[PDB]
Write a protein that binds this ligand. Structure first.
Ligand SMILES: Cc1cc2nc3c(=O)[nH]c(=O)nc-3n(C[C@H](O)[C@H](O)[C@H](O)COP(=O)(O)OP(=O)(O)OC[C@H]3O[C@@H](n4cnc5c(N)ncnc54)[C@H](O)[C@@H]3O)c2cc1C
Ligand SMILES: O=c1nc2n(C[C@H](O)[C@H](O)[C@H](O)CO)c3cc(O)ccc3cc-2c(=O)[nH]1
Length: 463
């Protein structure tokens, strides 16, 4: 059914719904992993199709709202998809396009297109679970899930929530020999569909990407400060970004990754978030590069351990966007400090506009507003001050999530929920010295940042 093959480890795929395979095509419902290369979900779909002697097709369902995403994210995504249509067409793989709630739309497409098998990629977010539940209730064919985003499938890396990077790391590293491997080439279709009410991705893109942008987003926020030229979308551009990282930035990454005045990060996160490039691919190429061992170890721990522990966090904590997901020590500490007098209480709107008393905080928010990607070091500072200057930890978490999800190109992502939870709630951290308001949550002061990098320069750049 799912045939054996070179580099096709069956542990990457599991049945969401087992059943009777139909005579029709294999449909890959693409959602998280928007690429044609290095995509285990697409590769498995193609293998299932080959075994059944049917075509494989791809379908995508555009929702007009997604976790507070606006025009900046939808346009980045849709420009990517425009390129993807060409790549898929070159492999003779049809791509179809739906609009609305994927729950309803995907199950109806499965009926209308007479799919014999359904496959999707893996996301641990609540919204994907909700769509999947609805689809299952509406189909009568087998439905598989493939982890295309993680090197080690999320449900294999650990059977539970990992409290620390140091408990996850040995589990993950022990499984790299099995799962850190090259990808096979995607075989083009050899079987022709020749196949109403179904529009192709090509069809819907004939009048451009702008026509597809959600109306509700534009109306809610014109997004005047966004600068679209910092990150070009799509698989080709992602590859360029990875190659320039390796060539120009990787050697200095270990020394300078915590300095937000230096452009020494990979800049891969928007591409990784939309699955326009594979983290497994990135790891393979970094492993091959001759660079500083310190920098390689640091980079690999981020894209392997911290990225995959974020999927672990969301997968094993259904309330990952809530205070109750925090470790017990942190809930106890924040609870004990709930009635401490705050020095500042900012509204969502004040934080959003960068209108605090702290110019480093404001500059961090301006980097986010202007570029859609805040430096990783200042993201920690930024979220921690939202805790410090909100009425409650719950309110802080709500605000941090909202701004991250509204404005980061790489947001609405397990890495964001996990990073915000680390920052505000000590998830995957330890307790530090007790303070008013913030209790034992790790503190990051303005003066501490001044000691570590040129704060004045960062502020000037985003003024
Ligand atoms: C408050 C807060 C919010 C965050 N929100 C997001 C988010 O919405 N989306 C997002 O992808 N990351 C988020 N992160 C994690 C991290 O800051 C970003 O992944 C990183 O800054 C992206 O830039 P880069 O790809 O140039 O990073 P690089 O340092 O080059 O890292 C390469 C890749 O490794 C992964 N990675 C790196 N650092 C982390 C980390 N700390 N946790 C998890 N994975 C990591 C990412 O996939 C990243 O793209 C957040 C962190 C914090 C503290
Ligand atoms: O399948 C979809 N995935 C969309 N995604 C992808 C999202 O990463 C996945 O839907 C989740 O991983 C759950 O599968 C978006 C991601 C963003 O950051 C912003 C907007 C979207 C919109 C959609 C969408 O309309 N349909």
């Amino acid at each position: 059914l799912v045939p054996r093959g070179s580099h096709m480890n069956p542990k990457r795929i599991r049945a969401l719904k087992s059943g009777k395979q139909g005579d029709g095509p294999v449909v890959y419902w693409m959602s998280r992993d928007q690429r044609a290369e290095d995509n285990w979900a697409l590769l498995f779909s193609r293998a299932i199709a080959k075994e059944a002697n049917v075509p494989v097709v791809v379908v995508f369902c555009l929702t007009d709202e997604f976790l507070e995403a606006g025009i900046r994210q939808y346009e980045f995504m849709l420009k990517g998809l425009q390129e993807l249509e060409v790549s898929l067409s070159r492999k003779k793989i049809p791509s179809f396009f739906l609009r609305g709630d994927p729950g309803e739309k995907i199950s109806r497409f499965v009926k209308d297109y007479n799919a014999g098998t359904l496959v999707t990629d893996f996301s641990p977010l609540r919204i994907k679970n909700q769509w999947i539940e609805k689809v299952i209730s509406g189909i009568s064919i087998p439905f598989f899930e493939v982890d295309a985003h993680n090197v080690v499938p999320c449900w294999e890396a650990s059977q539970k929530h990992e409290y620390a990077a140091h408990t996850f790391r040995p589990k993950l590293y022990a499984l790299l020999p099995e799962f850190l491997e090259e990808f096979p080439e995607l075989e083009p279709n050899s079987v022709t569909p020749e196949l109403g009410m179904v529009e192709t991705l090509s069809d819907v893109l004939e009048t451009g990407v702008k026509a597809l942008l959600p109306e509700r987003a534009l109306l809610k926020n014109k997004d005047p400060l966004f600068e679209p030229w910092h990150f070009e979308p799509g698989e080709k551009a992602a590859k360029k970004v990875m190659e320039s990282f390796i060539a120009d930035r990787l050697d200095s990454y270990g020394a300078l990754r915590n300095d937000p005045t230096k452009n020494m990060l990979s800049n891969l996160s928007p591409y990784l978030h939309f699955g326009q490039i594979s983290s497994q691919r990135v790891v393979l190429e970094v492993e091959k590069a001759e660079s500083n061992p310190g920098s390689k170890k640091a980079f690999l721990d981020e894209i392997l351990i911290w990225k995959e522990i974020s999927d672990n966090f969301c997968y094993y904590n259904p309330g990952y966007d809530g205070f109750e997901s925090f470790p017990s020590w942190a809930k106890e500490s924040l609870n004990a400090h709930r009635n401490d007098v705050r020095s500042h209480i900012y509204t969502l709107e004040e934080f959003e506009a960068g209108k605090t008393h702290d110019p480093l905080w404001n500059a961090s928010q301006m980097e986010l507003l202007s570029t859609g990607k805040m430096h990783g070091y200042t993201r920690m500072y930024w979220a921690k001050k939202i805790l410090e200057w909100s009425e409650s930890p719950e309110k802080a978490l709500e605000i941090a999530i909202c701004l991250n999800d509204r404005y980061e190109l790489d947001g609405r992502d397990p890495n964001g929920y996990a990073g915000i939870a680390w920052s505000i709630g000590g998830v995957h951290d330890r307790a530090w010295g007790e303070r008013e308001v913030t209790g034992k949550i790790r503190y990051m002061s303005y003066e501490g940042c001044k000691r570590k990098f040129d704060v004045k320069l960062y502020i000037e750049k985003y003024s």
